[PDB]
Amino acid sequence: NGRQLGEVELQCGICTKWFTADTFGIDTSSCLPFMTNYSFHCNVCHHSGNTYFLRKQANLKEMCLSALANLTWQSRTQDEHPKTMFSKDKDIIPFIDKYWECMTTRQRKMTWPNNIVKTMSKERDVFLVKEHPDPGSKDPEEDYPKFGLLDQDLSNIGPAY
Template identity: 30%
Template sequence: MKQEKQKKHTQNVQRKYCYCGKDRTLTTLNLQCIQCKNWFHVECLKNPKLIVSKTSIVPFMTNYRFTCQLCSPKEIFEKVTASWKDAINAAFANLSVERLRKEGLINKYGHGTSIIPEGYWFDKKDGICPFLDKHWEALCTNRARTPTWWATVGSCMYTSKDNYIAKDEHARSAASEFILSDRDLFNLRPTGQKFKEFYFEN
């Protein structure tokens, strides 16, 4: 039981993570090691060349496999194809953090509340899709921008009732405003740890 808990390593009581032993942050990317499940600040990586371009990463992305230098002689980082849900979750997280920062609930060091307050609604049109469009390279690795991808995002949110709560739940639609059902940002982590081959959608 105890081991099971440790393995998840989403949060620890001491709030000590990374090589540096400091707390997780909400405004820069923290990478979870596939082996030890510890989290590492991107700015603390031992190999500064591990991440090739800044546009290939964004906080709360989960479409990667990372191994830390405590688990391997060298750090390993590779991108994998994200599900739409992974990409959409990252969009919700970043839009929420942006608003938390504006409201002074997260400071400039990226510390503060990791719980999205009630009422932080975002819709496909003005929130999620523009964010995905802007961070496509980071979040939608190898995905083709099909003419209907906006509709795909909408229907993903609409149908994933376990993941997204609609403001107008009784009249839930692809155009609804949504919030993550698990509002703790620190619970977002790479789940598709099995290596998934790149694939294309029609």
């Protein structure tokens, strides 16, 4: 499966295959791995024989999905001990904050930090939710709540064609 997880990859909405954006000289400086807020056609499938790339403003869900996918990929490849569950306050929100411009051109009291929990809590087939540490855990309360992706197969993440 010809994937390059961790690169900025883009799936073509017509042929449904995967590509890394670099392959085309697309500017990735404002891009992120594991985005879903775009529509892409490869140059084989698109009418003009050029690439098509339509970036959409990320909704709450896309922001969470991309933060979680990225935090989880980085933890899986860099940490001695991989985490799959990330803190809303210490991890998710600083991510969204930091890479804001990679997900939206909206200008920046932002109200989105209040709403990300509702967002993930209602998409239970996408997100894993722990309001509190497991009984018998040494995990400190301050770090909670915590969120993670139901589907740990990061290749499955893509636009909603």
